Amino acid sequence: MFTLKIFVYTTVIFFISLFVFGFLSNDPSRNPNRK
Amino acid sequence: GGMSVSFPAYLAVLLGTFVPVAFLVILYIQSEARKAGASSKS
Amino acid sequence: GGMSVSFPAYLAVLLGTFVPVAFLVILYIQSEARKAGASSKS
Amino acid sequence: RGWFDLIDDWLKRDRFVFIGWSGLLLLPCSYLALGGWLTGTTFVTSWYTHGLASSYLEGCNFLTAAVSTPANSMGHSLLFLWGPEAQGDFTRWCQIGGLWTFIALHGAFGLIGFCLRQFEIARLVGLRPYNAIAFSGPISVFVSVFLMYPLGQASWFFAPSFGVAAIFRFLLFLQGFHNWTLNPFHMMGVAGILGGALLCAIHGATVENTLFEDGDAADTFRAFTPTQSEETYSMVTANRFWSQIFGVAFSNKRWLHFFMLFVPVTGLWTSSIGIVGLALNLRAYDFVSQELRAAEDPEFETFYTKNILLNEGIRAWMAAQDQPHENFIFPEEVLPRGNAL
Amino acid sequence: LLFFFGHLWHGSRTLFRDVFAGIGAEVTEQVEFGAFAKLGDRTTKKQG
Amino acid sequence: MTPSLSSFINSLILGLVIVVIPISGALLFVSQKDKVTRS
Amino acid sequence: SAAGRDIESTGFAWWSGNARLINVSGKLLGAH
Amino acid sequence: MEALVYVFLLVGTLMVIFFAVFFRDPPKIAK
Amino acid sequence: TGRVPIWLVAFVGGIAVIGLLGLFIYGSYSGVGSSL
Amino acid sequence: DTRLLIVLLPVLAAASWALYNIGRVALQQFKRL
Amino acid sequence: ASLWERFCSWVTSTENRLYIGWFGVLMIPTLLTATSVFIIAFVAAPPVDIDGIREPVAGSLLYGNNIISGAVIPSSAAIGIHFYPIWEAASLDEWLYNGGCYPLIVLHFLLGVACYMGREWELSYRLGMRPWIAVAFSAPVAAATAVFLIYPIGQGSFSDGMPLGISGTFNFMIVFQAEHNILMHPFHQLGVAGVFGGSLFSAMHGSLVTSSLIRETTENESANYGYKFGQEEETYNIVAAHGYFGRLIFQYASFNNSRSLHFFLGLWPVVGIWLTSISVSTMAFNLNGFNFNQSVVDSQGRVINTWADIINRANLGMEVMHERNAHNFPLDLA
Amino acid sequence: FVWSGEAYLSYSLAALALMGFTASCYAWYNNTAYPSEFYGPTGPEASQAQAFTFLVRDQRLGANVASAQGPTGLGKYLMRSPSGEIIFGGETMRFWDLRAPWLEP
Amino acid sequence: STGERPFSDIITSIRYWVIHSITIPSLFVAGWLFVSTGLAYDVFGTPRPNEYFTQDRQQVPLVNDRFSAKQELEDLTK
Amino acid sequence: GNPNQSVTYPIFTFRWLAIHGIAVPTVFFLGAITSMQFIQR
Amino acid sequence: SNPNPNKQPVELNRTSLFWGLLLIFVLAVLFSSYFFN
Amino acid sequence: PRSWLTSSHFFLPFFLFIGHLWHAGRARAAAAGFEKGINRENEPVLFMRPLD
Amino acid sequence: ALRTRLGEILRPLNSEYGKVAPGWGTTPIMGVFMLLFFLFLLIILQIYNSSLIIENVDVDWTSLGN
Ligand code: CLA
Ligand code: CLA
Ligand code: CLA
Ligand SMILES: CC(C)=CCC/C(C)=C/CC/C(C)=C/CC/C(C)=C/CC/C(C)=C/CC/C(C)=C/CC/C(C)=C\CC/C(C)=C/CC/C(C)=C/CC1=CC(=O)C(C)=C(C)C1=O
Ligand SMILES: CCCCCCCCCCCCCCCC(=O)OC[C@H](COP(=O)(O)OC[C@@H](O)CO)OC(=O)CCCCCCCCCCCCCCC
Ligand SMILES: CC1=C(\C=C/C(C)=C/C=C\C(C)=C\C=C/C=C(C)\C=C\C=C(C)\C=C\C2=C(C)CCCC2(C)C)C(C)(C)CCC1
Ligand SMILES: [Cl-]
Ligand SMILES: [Fe+3]
Structure with a gap:
């Protein structure tokens, strides 16, 4: 039952660190009209 | 005053009829609509 | 351990589904077969 | 020249408000129905009808005031001012309840006159008649809740009374006594009205959001003249946005605006079909598969089975106060209470 | 109740038969306000 | 002869007399003021 | 010198006519 | 016995949602 | 100048709307129909 | 009956001030057409 | 050119069939586990003790329950608003008895539509357009926050939230109007004027477009085939539909600016559902509706009933009969 | 970030939305920074004072106030928490985590 | 654009306020005397707040007959 | 800007009658509703 | 018994199929609970 | 007073979140350039490949 | 066009x-009858x-009685 808590918190942090380091990687240059 | 028959068999006959009956009417109407598309309005 | 429902209603739903579902698939396949007869092989 | 051709020239003339040949039916009957509500909500009591004080004259505000439904004692009567119930007297005809059939008959002959007006404008200016068709939803609610629902029931008493809080009885009246919510025609109607409120919100706030930069100012409301040939918004971008956000998207602006006609009207017409069946007590009250089971299992419970017990609370507590002509003298021990309150 | 709509559709259709495909190009100058005395009558071109 | 009957016939006169006034009031209002080039 | 108190001096209309103070820092300080 | 009907109707209307997104008639600009 | 401004005829007609609605909230806390 | 003409007396005072300022100009309209 | 920038330009790429942007890195795995638990617990969930009074409610398709009766039942009231995931249970079926499926769906669904709302911003940035379709989706997201999260925050347990089912929503509405009087609340009053008003203006604006189309089509074929997609010109006379509706009411009651007309379509239902979503959340902290019970009294002091009392006799009858053995004390949460 | 005037407002509206939602749940749950003698009793402790004032009254009528045998089979007055604490029974078991200065003695 | 005198060139005109800076009060005052001289209770049948009950009638009044409701409502008040 | 000095215009139009059907009952009833709430029981 | 001139073909695109396949299914989603009772 | 202070502090900070969604949208659309609408000379959708 | 004995x-x-x-025809005769x-x-x-x-x-159910 603890092994699910190790497995969920792997997955929740994985999509959160894709979220935080995704928007830190120059998001207002992803528009049209040259970058 | 009654005749105890198998109650799923109303679905075995009517879906056993109307699913392959509708398969042939699907194939026939498109076969004549392809003839009408090719002969007329070519 | 059981739920006493209306036994003709299996025919009311499944023929109520598969008769108008088969009506639209009859009309759609002949509409594209008329397009295929007119655009191609004219 | 002519004589009948003269009156067609004057009545169909261009003015500020338009009369038309429908205005001989609309403009009196809309005036005495909209004004007949406003003079019975202001002055006329309901004390000899329901035992309820409901007017602004005797201490009610805009919510809790109404022209109430006439009586159970009259019973489907048309209740004319010159009629056999209230002969000649205006003060008795207000006290019997005859203003309700003054409004609901002038309302039923005013909505004829407004839908004949939408035929008469679109024929004269040369349009298509798709506004009298979209108004047939609002006709079919007034003709089926205010007229065809009480005519099947017992009297005019069980009709909706024209008021803000008197409607709020009628929503809870059809919950306790009819299980209206479980009626699948009404659930066709909720997805027609909340679908029409979606389509007004999601189309109005995407052509204010995918629009062409036509002007040079910061606000965009000034960048449109009515008689421009070009499109004021981008259809290809709004198709591109909803194809990737939602998955499906319209490709036809002409089919898009018909879908904003069909979703509210064929939602409003389907719930009108159910409340015609609610006049006859042909209601969708209970699931008989689950009432046999819950009687044959005293631990089977669902939110449907909890919804039935809430209806017997409504129908047993309100009945001494809602229908006082019946004289329901239920003691405090026989009405269904729960536990501790 | 359902036949009340289809009469109201067919009465809409048998009068408005020529605009069933859509309105023409004659509509734009006969609609704008105060142009004509009688609405929908091009013989009443008020003027001067 | 019944008072419920004679109140209906008196309603037909009082329905006529009050609502001949928009019949004539839409007839005086056109023979004094009309369109210029029409029917 | 003085700037921005109209429709076609900034682009914003009167109902947005509180947002002519974005590039105007002196009036914005007296606005706060 | 009848829950097979509700699971068939709910999955069977969830396939029409799947087929209308990915197998749709592709809107192409009037060339 | 023989003219009233348009914003003035909506101003003194605007106070009376607040004035009539001000008496309708006061009258719900007084008199008949105010639970007193 | 006697309180009905207390209600309609400001209405009769309303139309009397209305037919003081308009009765020259409302005679112009009915004589024009 | 980097090992991350080649991934970072795939997530923010508009070439995919569905946009899979940086808000879609959160809403795709959260909604897909709010779908996979909703579909399974609608079919085959065991009965759930919702009230904490050790009487379970059976709301899944295995246990009877045709789909206008089945629901993913809310959590136990003994649990409350306590965080109840799977790993804080002794076993997985002990987690199912207390109704653990309801916070696992509704915290992932609410976090999924909050990142649907950012994803609706995000494609309006990469496509180069005005971005406020996220604002119009903030009216259903707040209304899905009001019945699912804020009403369990104010009223204590997660059992007071809306059940994920069709007959559960009708049970949620009757219990709400027993204890909070939403029908006589002036912000729900505005929301049904933005729901009827939004349904009016859909049937009004959608009518006047389709009644004033210029005929780029034949007679026998369909009317919609006359609008070639992606064309430059307008398909309907705005000047004729304005001249229609300027004859219907009067001339200056109708927008012949079609941008101010279409903004009024985006303002009347969206502000109305913003005021409904406030009202349920302000009634969550028990700022109820209007209470004109027993207001009209005569000179002797005898109570005269008004129309708010006959609502109250309905409101009292669904007050004594909801939660029929969950109360032990005479006042409801007082 | 975006470096503009409309941007720096938008960072601060999301921060003030976070503080305004937090200040609501201070006013609804806390009774130490928002004391009960001034702001009134909170949402939980009104529901727990009702269970306390009927625990008193039926004890003053001579009942053993534990072993209540409440109507659903659970505790009427005194009950067991899910973590195993002795709490008030009834509907008020959802507010079992109440710390209030008139019952914490 | 219709041929008659425009709306906002009427409201701004000085004859318009010279004619009814008085008759907008004179309808407001005539509405005031309709509900204060006891006429609004009488011609619409609304009871006065001391005329709800009666020393002979402590119960609520409700109509029972349909055709003789003129004879009943006469014997239901006083 | 200036008043309409000499242009002819009808005064008793149908827009005059259409307003006064909804305005003259309004200013009668407002003022009747204003007098209802000084009424003490 | 001449050839008829008034005959005309019927069209149905893929959008109209997917609405009709959605409508007939959802009315069977809605009304199955009431037919089964 | 708790029932006013909590109810009005859903009314203010929910709306204060809505204007954040208005202004995080508008500031990144004004700094990019398309705050007055889509440029008609080059809209970015017409220079993209279609979906399928 | 096929012409038969029926x-x-x-034909007329x-x-x-x-x-x-x-x-105008018999329209004032018609408007009396309408x-x-x-x-x-x-x-x-x-x-x-x-x-x-x-x-x-008598519009009672006892009209067709004994
Ligand atoms: C010797 C002479 C004679 C006699 C004794 C009768 C006897 C009768 N006629 Mg009759 N009739 C006669 C000559 C005669 N007719 C002639 C010469 C004509 C001209 C051809 C007619 C034309 C005629 C018609 C057209 C009708 C009758 C009807 C009737 C019956 C009335 C009782 C009844 O049930 O009505 C009950 C019916 C009504 C009172 C009709 C009311 C309908 C209202 C006005 C409109 C309702 C619909 C409307 C659209 C509103 C919808 C809104 C909704 C929400 C409510 C009765 C059997 C009626 C009938 O048979 O109905 C059963 C009827 O409709 N008659
Ligand atoms: C999370 C929010 C949510 C969702 C998804 C639904 C969904 C639904 N409601 Mg509901 N409702 C909600 C909140 C919600 N409601 C709230 C807050 C209230 C007020 C208390 C109500 C009050 C309410 C009433 C009173 C009624 C409904 C009805 C309905 C159904 C049809 C809706 C319709 O015609 O509207 C318009 C719909 C659209 C514009 C888009 C279609 C959306 C589809 C139908 C949603 C399907 C959801 C379903 C779970 C499938 C998900 C698939 C997924 C698992 C892959 C549908 C099942 C009606 C009903 O009973 O029908 C069964 C009905 O009568 N609802
Ligand atoms: C600290 C908060 C804050 C600040 C500084 C701003 C600042 C600004 N906003 Mg913004 N906004 C905010 C919060 C804020 N906003 C919130 C909370 C929302 C969500 C409701 C919005 C939604 C919003 C929109 C939709 C728009 C702006 C716009 C603007 C700009 C001009 C404002 C204007 O002209 O209004 C002038 C003021 C009015 C017209 C009056 C409005 C009155 C409202 C409708 C009623 C308020 C009810 C209130 C609770 C109670 C009133 C009592 C009543 C009895 C009178 C300016 C930069 C505009 C913009 O983009 O410009 C760049 C714009 O279009 N704002
Ligand atoms: C395991 C499971 C699944 C369990 C769940 C069980 C469960 C809850 C089952 C119930 C499910 C269910 C479907 C119940 C339905 C209830 C019921 C009886 C429905 C009957 C259907 C009904 C009301 C028929 C009558 C007709 C009618 C009124 C239909 C209403 C239509 C409706 C509801 C919705 C359509 C509205 C809608 C979603 C519009 C979106 C439009 C949109 C975004 C278009 C895209 C788009 C937008 C633009 O703006 C532009 C510019 C372009 C260009 C563009 O393209
Ligand atoms: C996780 C990331 C987000 C993914 C979201 C996925 C959701 C996809 C939803 C697709 C629905 C498509 C429905 C077919 C309909 C369809 O695909 O029609 C296709 C149609 C295409 O329009 P066009 O522009 O091509 O029109 C041109 C033709 O009509 C010309 O004749 O789109 C619409 O009409 C608007 C769609 C409205 C929205 C659809 C209704 C939504 C309700 C869905 C019912 C749910 C039931 C649930 C029961 C279990
Ligand atoms: C039935 C009757 C009659 C009569 C009728 C009439 C004539 C009526 C009228 C009426 C009128 C003529 C009026 C009334 C009323 C009105 C009103 C009551 C108004 C107004 C108010 C309001 C509207 C409110 C509020 C507000 C304001 C102030 C504004 C802003 C908004 C609001 C809403 C807030 C007859 C003779 C047939 C006979 C028998 C009896
Ligand atoms: Cl309790
Ligand atoms: Fe449109």
């Missing part, structure tokens, strides 16, 4: 398509509704 004896019935009466039929329909509606109770007409 289509030849029904389907003959005068669009052969109207000029001007008015009298509507006047007939308000009578029997009020007889059914007991707003037009006439002598020896």
